[PDB]
Design a protein around this nucleic acid. Sequence first.
DNA 1: AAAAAAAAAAAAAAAAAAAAAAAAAAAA
DNA 2: TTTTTTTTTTTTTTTTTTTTTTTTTTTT
Lengths: 257, 257, 165, 14
Amino acid sequence: EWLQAEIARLKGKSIVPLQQVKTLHDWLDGKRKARKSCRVVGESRTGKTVACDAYRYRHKPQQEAGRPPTVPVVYIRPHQKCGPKDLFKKITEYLKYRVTKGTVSDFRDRTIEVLKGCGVEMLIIDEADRLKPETFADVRDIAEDLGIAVVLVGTDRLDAVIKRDEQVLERFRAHLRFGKLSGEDFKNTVEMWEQMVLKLPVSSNLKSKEMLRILTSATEGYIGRLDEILREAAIRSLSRGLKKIDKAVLQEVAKEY
Amino acid sequence: EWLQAEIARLKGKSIVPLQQVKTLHDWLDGKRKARKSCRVVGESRTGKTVACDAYRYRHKPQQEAGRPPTVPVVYIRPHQKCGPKDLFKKITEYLKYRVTKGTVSDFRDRTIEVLKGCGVEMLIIDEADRLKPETFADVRDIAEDLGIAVVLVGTDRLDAVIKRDEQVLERFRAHLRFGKLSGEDFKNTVEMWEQMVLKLPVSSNLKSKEMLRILTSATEGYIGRLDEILREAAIRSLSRGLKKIDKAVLQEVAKEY
Amino acid sequence: IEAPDVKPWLFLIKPYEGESLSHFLGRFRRANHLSASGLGTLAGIGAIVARWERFHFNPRPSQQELEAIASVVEVDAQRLAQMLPPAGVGMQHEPIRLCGACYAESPCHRIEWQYKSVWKCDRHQLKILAKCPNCQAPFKMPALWEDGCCHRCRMPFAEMAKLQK
Amino acid sequence: IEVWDYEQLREEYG
DNA sequence: AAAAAAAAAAAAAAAAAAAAAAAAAAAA
DNA sequence: TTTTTTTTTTTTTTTTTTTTTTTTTTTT
Ligand SMILES: Nc1ncnc2c1ncn2[C@@H]1O[C@H](COP(=O)(O)OP(=O)(O)OP(=O)(O)O)[C@@H](O)[C@H]1O
Ligand SMILES: Nc1ncnc2c1ncn2[C@@H]1O[C@H](COP(=O)(O)OP(=O)(O)OP(=O)(O)O)[C@@H](O)[C@H]1O
Ligand SMILES: [Mg+2]
Ligand SMILES: [Mg+2]
């Protein structure tokens, strides 16, 4: 069924090279060669996790016939109230080697062995504020011991955690911030999203003045909402046999937000 | 004894289709296919928990002789001050999976393995505000990691808890609200309850103006009160050898509330 | 209350022909995420099962731990019995031998390789390894194997089969 | 411009 | 005929701390 | 006569941490 094929697509995910994303990739590269640690901050729906993920994938791990994989970038995400053991365990799994059973000092010794030899240039920690305050001792330790850049990614709260300790604030003083959509940038996005993500047969033509008012109020500049809203509108719309997104169905969706 | 058979019936429980209930079932279905998380809000006697049951039962789990089941909908209720360990344990038990002692990270790894493979599309969490603030990290994690819609069900306080954290507010921004009975809807309900639930040989003829006044003042539109009150009135009334509900016996019951 | 018309269950695996016990139990523990003590606990047979993973079998508790455990792994006592050397024969211990040539067919370990008399594979016609050819380390129990990868020297394990014979 | 599917990157992964 | 060195599961003990909660206090 | 706003102890928890007691499994 043609309709079923299309609904499954719309329910999925994709990466669109937005203006905000291009900047981060170049900034991190600077930091990568310079081998310096830094942090990235911004509001929770700005798409920080995605920009950082897209980056990870542009540097495929490499493999020769003999030695272990060389893995320039490591991306991990902690659990809530992450302890010192939990951080090493995830780094070790990420790199495909598993050590089971021992004490904290053993996970640490083993983490430094897999981080060495195997080239690692950058470690990215998502939701950095899930880290328990003491774990930063182990994050600094690695950052200073090995020539590995460490990047901390998070919301404004992350800085509230960092500013409570001078030892950390100073290693991670440099920062980049993500912002929101506005003005001409919000409009250009909307148009890209229509052609690049929705793809209905009949042009729904949203950049029109009358329609942008609806979207602006509904989304308030967060790329997160903009995506959810236009996808929910094409899916609802197709389920009812329409060939485009109109004004009333868009309002029907926006009303629920 | 004929009379005893009848008292036992009245003492029990049943589900009556109502408009409130139908609305939810269709709304959730939208959300299920779209795979989007949401919340349901409303006052505590509107019958939210019961609508959720009625929903669960419309999708029979399937099972083959050897491999694991397919369970499209999972419904759980937390205990007060629910922690991260308590949530995983209840998810794992609801599927009749055998498990014992281990640490929090171990229940977490297990929760993702039983949620995977086993078709699960939606998770519904009742009494949602019993969750401790940190557990929401685990609720978001699942919602983002697995294509599972999470529905939070609760009273106005639920939103007071949610607004304390921007990370949660945004995943669960869309909502549906349950309301109270009024006007013609309260009147039609009362009538349904007489024909579909009470069933006395003597015919009550409740919808009468002078009787609805009694019930309206007594119940203030809550379906909860309406049910308890008419059932307490038929049981008391039968025990006294009457064949119908009159005005005085109804007032005798309502006076106690 | 919990969902209707279901029974208690766990994740099952199928044995391969010739598969060894230590190996089998390891797959099982991994599929279901648990400790050996854990298996012993669901089972109610004590801590005794952990040395099985490194091939120590003083007994054949054929009607005790072994008849009983079938109910957890969903494999019958006899198929399970077959995962150990017949009383009186075989019984090798320290080196763990392997024929990587068969790994192209199925990752596994074949228990026959640990009977005392073996040094060659007849099915693939060749010298059996008793030690790693590159890093020259002995191998870890079949029971603790991961993804068909060598920690000492990562390779495809299967990729090693062109060499040594 | 190139645009990527989200699961594709995983299918082509190192 | 028999004994010895040990890998592991199990067991109090501390053990430091994150958070909710309990007062104390100042004004218009 | 109420509204924040600050300080502070009592507890409760979840690791983790080191440790002994025991039970074993085999080799000439
Ligand atoms: N380049 C992009 N193309 C399409 N969608 C994007 C893009 N960047 C972000 N998004 C949207 O953001 C969502 C992914 O999460 P997001 O990028 O907000 O991570 P995040 O901002 O780090 O979240 P949080 O900070 O709350 O953890 C997706 O639902 C997607 O619609
Ligand atoms: N569809 C229905 N059919 C029959 N009875 C119903 C229905 N919906 C609600 N009720 C009545 O409501 C009661 C169930 O509790 P109800 O859902 O009203 O409160 P609740 O929302 O579960 O409370 P809380 O949200 O505080 O847990 C039952 O005693 C029943 O008589
Ligand atoms: Mg993120
Ligand atoms: Mg309820």
